[PDB]
A paper describes a structure:
The virulence of P. gingivalis is dependent on secreted cysteine proteases called gingipains (RgpA, RgpB, and Kgp) that are essential for corruption of the host immune system and acquisition of nutrients and heme – a vital growth factor and source of black pigmentation of colonies on blood agar. Gingipains are synthesized with a typical N-terminal signal peptide targeting them to the Sec translocon and are exported through the OM via a novel secretion system referred to as “Por Secretion System; PorSS” or following the naming convention, Type IX Secretion System (T9SS)7. Translocation of gingipains from the periplasm across the OM is dependent on a conserved C-terminal domain (CTD), which appears to be important for secretion of the proteins and in particular, truncation of the last few C-terminal residues of this domain leads to accumulation of gingipains in the periplasm. Here, we show for the first time that the OM translocation signal, a conserved CTD of RgpB, has a typical Ig-like fold encompassing seven antiparallel β-strands organized in two β-sheets that are packed against each other in a β-sandwich.
The three structures were solved and refined with diffraction data to 1.9 Å, 2.4 Å, and 2.1 Å resolution, respectively. In each tandem, the IgSF and CTD domains showed an orthogonal arrangement, with their longest axes tilted by 90 degrees with respect to each other. The lack of cleavage observed within the linker by elastase is clearly not due to inaccessibility of this loop to proteolytic enzymes, as proteins bearing the IEGRAA motif by insertion/substitution were efficiently cleaved at the Arg-Ala peptide bond by fXa.
Numbering used by the authors: 579 to 662, 672 to 736
Write the structure that this text describes.
Amino acid sequence: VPTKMQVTAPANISASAQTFEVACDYNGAIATLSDDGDMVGTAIVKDGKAIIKLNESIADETNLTLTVVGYNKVTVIKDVKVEGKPYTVAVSGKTITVESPAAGLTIFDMNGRRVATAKNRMVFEAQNGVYAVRIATEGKTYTEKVIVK
């Protein structure tokens, strides 16, 4: 029969974040952030903390799952909200065109840095790489991930 461990972590994470700190009272436990199957980062608990260094931008996520696993411990799971149909995200070479009536549009680069903010419509002039696009309507945020060659 496994025992319990104590885990405390924020309820939210910035779309631009680079790390995520989890307190846990079992040294050697493993804390991991994921979007079911995309493993976005992992750290071992040492001195009561795991500082998860994210391996990719999470700006294309609305939620992530925190999982903390330990030898003979009951696994602890938490949802974490990531905070920056009725739209289109278009790519054409180096330009990304985003449209959605009455929406906040945001674009983030592959280092999680926010590169563009506009209302309703924008054209963004990109560089080679992967971007996240956030379209924030009333009641709901959507995201897409765009590859620019």
